[PDB]
């Protein structure tokens, strides 16, 4: 079930790909925020992508309550590190989570220096 600050059924996963190199985007920083009652963004979780370009264990079912979340992906530092000066400061994904019960969320991002695409895969959890 839940847990409380780690990785329940993995309710939140992030996957980043590099469209220039045809590979996972490794060591990409990220930051997740939750909108608090006062309308500010409070820190919720952060991590870096693995060699497979994925980030797991950001949260648990218990901690991942109903709310508005923002996933910031630090695309700028990734590209600079490669010798490329990209267009965007970062990629942001803002969505309401769990408003009709708990769901599992996969945020995928595909990166190019002047372009990014993002998609969400939402699953009604556990089989």
Ligand X SMILES: N[C@@H](Cc1cc(I)c(Oc2cc(I)c(O)c(I)c2)c(I)c1)C(=O)O
- Compute the half-sphere exposure of residue 17: CA atoms within 13 Å on the CB side of its CA: 9
Options 36, 81, 82, 94; binder of a second copy; rule CB under 8 A: 94
| 48 carries a ligand binding annotation | no
Q: Which is nearer to ligand X, 5 or 52 (CB)?
A: 52
CA–CA dist 73, 107 (Å, integer): 11
Do 26 and 111 form a contact (C-beta atoms < 8 A)? Answer: no
User: Which residue has tokens 């939402």?
Assistant: 122
Question: Could you tell me the smallest distance in angstroms from the CB atom of residue 58 to ligand X?
Answer: 14
CB of 56 to ligand X, least distance (A): 9
Which residue, 3 or 118, is less far from a second copy as judged by CB?
Answer: 118
């Amino acid at each position: 079930g839940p847990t409380g600050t780690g990785e329940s059924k993995c309710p939140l996963m992030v996957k980043v790909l590099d469209a220039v190199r045809g590979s996972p985007a490794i060591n990409v920083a990220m930051h997740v925020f939750r909108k608090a009652a006062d309308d500010t963004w409070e820190p919720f979780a952060s991590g870096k992508t693995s060699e497979s370009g994925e980030l797991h264990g950001l949260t648990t079912e218990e901690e991942f309550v109903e709310g508005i979340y923002k996933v910031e992906i630090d695309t700028k530092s990734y590209w600079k590190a490669l010798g490329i000066s990209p267009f965007h400061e970062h990629a942001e994904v803002v969505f309401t989570a769990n408003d009709s019960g708990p769901r599992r969320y996969t945020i995928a991002a595909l990166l190019s220096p002047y372009s990014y695409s993002t998609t969400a895969v939402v699953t009604n959890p556990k089989e």
